[PDB]
Amino acid sequence: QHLICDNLLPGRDLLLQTRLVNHVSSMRPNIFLGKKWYYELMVDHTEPFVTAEATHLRVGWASTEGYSPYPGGGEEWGGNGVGDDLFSYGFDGLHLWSGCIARTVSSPNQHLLRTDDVISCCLDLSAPSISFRINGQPVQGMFENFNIDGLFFPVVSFSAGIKVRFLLGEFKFLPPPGYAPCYEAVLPKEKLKVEHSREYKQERTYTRDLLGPTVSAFTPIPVDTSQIVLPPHLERIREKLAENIHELWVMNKIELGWQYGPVRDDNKRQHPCLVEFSKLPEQERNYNLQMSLETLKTLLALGCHVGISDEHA
Amino acid sequence: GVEIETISPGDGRTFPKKGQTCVVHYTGMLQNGKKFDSSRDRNKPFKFRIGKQEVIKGFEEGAAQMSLGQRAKLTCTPDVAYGATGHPGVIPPNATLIFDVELLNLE
Amino acid sequence: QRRNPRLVPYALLDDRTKKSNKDSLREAVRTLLGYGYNLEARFRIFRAEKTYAVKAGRWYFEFEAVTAGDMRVGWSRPGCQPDQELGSDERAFAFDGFKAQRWHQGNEHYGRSWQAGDVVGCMVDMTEHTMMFTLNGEILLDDSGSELAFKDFDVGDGFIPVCSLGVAQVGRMNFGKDVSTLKYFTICGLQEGYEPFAVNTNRDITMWLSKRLPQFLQVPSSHEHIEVTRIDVTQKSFGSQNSSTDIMFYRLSMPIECTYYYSVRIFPNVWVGWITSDFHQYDTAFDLVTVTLGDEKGKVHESIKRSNYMVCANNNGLEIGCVVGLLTFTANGKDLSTYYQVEPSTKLFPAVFAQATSPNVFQFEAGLFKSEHKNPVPQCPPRLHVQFLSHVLWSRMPNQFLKVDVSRISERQGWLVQCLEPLQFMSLHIPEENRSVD
């Protein structure tokens, strides 16, 4: 038996291996992100061993396309910074993980995550470098040059008796490096929710409801304008309708209570382009000329073949 | 031999002395990412009298440095460990240790 | 437009910067009318646990369908693979309330449609081989107008409840437990003399669902038709004798920790790599991260690594993955440069990615390889030994529900995400083909 348990235990490859692992949970604040970007966190309580295991605090960023963040149904053991769709940071002795990598580049404290810590985190727009500040101190930059594909968000993971403060808007303490806050995607209509990070469950007495997956940006991509050919028999009516558009633009300021004057103003109601379509030169009326031209190019391009059926006026 | 990270500091100045028994909580694991021992596991704080030369060498070298509350990482050289023999059943021949020692008290 | 709040697309904003624009466009279209012109013109199969495969009884569960879409809900034998769709086998027996048809080996119209927020249901009589479907108290009839939906199904390996949601939907099931709070079993059911699942049990019935994340797996003999061979110099040759030819990834079985090389023969365009075991990306793409050092400030401190997986590309492509602690790349006697010589202590699956153009697509294997990889490690002549596999990245396999997750509270002032009560796994991991199961 000594011979068995010398030649067969310690290699740990032939038969299996098992141990208990603490339930990881990651949570994201409902802000997808395609300026630069930035956030904070402060830690309230850690209770670093309410398990017989080191409890983790991974703070950082993640991509989106792909990315099923499943508890126990992802990578090894459940984690953060374990797949390459993830980029996080934070330890007792604060070193990162990015793809289950343990590299221990230092800090000017060699600090824990204690219950009194400020984690400043920044992501750079299109210069793909991530850097993390502890208490304003730069923490010896590591992250560079990633796959900018899919959106981005903060992820932060935790598994203990742990509660922490989001500073996302009640901002508390935030340095400016780079700059733009996380508060710049709540602008148009959206809200500030924080969710479980992607939920094949939703826990309930009766039945957890289910979830078909998803359907998955501020670069403006319209229909192209200038590459549309105008025949001249359309161009006659186009110039006459640009004249009609300019005289309606005169009538618009007549309705809105304006006056012709040599001063190009809007604070004394004096406007220098209330004269006709051609009596304005082609550096103030050409912006309406080409507007009507491209409008009829689009009308000949949007599949509405408007034929000439009446008189042009 | 022993190469120490400070995981959590203590005070830095109340480091132990000969004739003392240190009360630790070591959770030592292999080089390869696999756990072999944990005094967090059976919830008994391990004790040992420095100067009587009980424990393996690198563990005693690292317990000389830590302070009254310092948690550290005693990455031991494989000749400072069990060695070319290894521990027959747990540690393989010529293996490296990555401890995790949270020193607590003195006696 | 600096940091001006006009960083918006047009359709996403309010109805304030649209009034003057749409009105001036209507004025231009009225100049056109004044000129006389008018402008005239995927899956999450949620299923119950295989040990609950009921096989002689009278069972029912009532399924709330919530939002419209692909909702294929009914019973199945446990051999329903999540990868292929529902119904198009002899193993799925379910009803699709949307579009009013029921699924077995193709289409057959049945029943009705469902209001968004109704509770559907599916009975089974095991003894008398009839499997009834309900909706909202009304027994769903055939096109013939008869109650018994499916008939004379064989009682084989039991039946398990299955819900197959679609794209952006929500479903809700009912698994006994809740006798007073059964919705439509109290109307039809109780009076007829049926029982739900969990009148007796004292658990929650743990479910399985497919993952989006693909994981590799052996090549079973009942594949489409892909025949890896075992030939012994020391070849594992191939073939893809099908019409279905999307992309077939290939992993050799066991990794290398951190001297000997390894030859891949190409018959027909073809990628060769060294997968680190976290490669779960199944597309027609070419993608995966550079961590830099710090000298307490940086300032030299750059080159660590990149890895994730590994890239290469007349008569035969005889490409060779030469190893070590680093990597290089040689091919067909020459040395295809730009090698990714970076591994601190990684594990590397020797791997190959390809599309099927023909049958007979590959072969496998200044010393050689096996004895740096097995247990006996002089052993300088190479040989294959029967642990070796030729894995295929399959898209989906079922995965456990994890009946309790964490007690969690998110909040408002400070946004206090808060978890206090700990929960632990019981998680093994197989070491030879590195991945973690619980």
Swiss-Prot record, chain B:
The lineage of its organism: Eukaryota, Metazoa, Chordata, Craniata, Vertebrata. Disulfide bonds: none annotated. GO terms for molecular function: calcium channel inhibitor activity; calcium channel regulator activity; FK506 binding; peptidyl-prolyl cis-trans isomerase activity; signaling receptor binding; transmembrane transporter binding. Detected in heart muscle (at protein level). Isoform 1 and isoform 2 are ubiquitous with highest levels in brain and thymus. Belongs to the FKBP-type PPIase family. FKBP1 subfamily. It comes from the Eukaryota. Keywords: Cytoplasm, Isomerase, Rotamase, Sarcoplasmic reticulum. Gene3D superfamilies: 3.10.50.40. It catalyses: [protein]-peptidylproline (omega=180) = [protein]-peptidylproline (omega=0). Residues 19-107 form the PPIase FKBP-type domain. It comes from Homo sapiens. Its main location: cytoplasm. Its EC number is 5.2.1.8. GO terms for cellular component: calcium channel complex; cytoplasm; membrane; sarcoplasmic reticulum membrane; Z disc. GO terms for biological process: 'de novo' protein folding; calcium-mediated signaling; insulin secretion involved in cellular response to glucose stimulus; negative regulation of calcium-mediated signaling; negative regulation of heart rate; negative regulation of insulin secretion involved in cellular response to glucose stimulus; negative regulation of release of sequestered calcium ion into cytosol; neuronal action potential propagation. It is an enzyme of class 5 (isomerase). Inhibited by both FK506 and rapamycin. Identified in a complex composed of RYR2, FKBP1B, PKA catalytic subunit, PRKAR2A, AKAP6, and the protein phosphatases PP2A and PP1. Interacts directly with RYR2. This is Peptidyl-prolyl cis-trans isomerase FKBP1B.
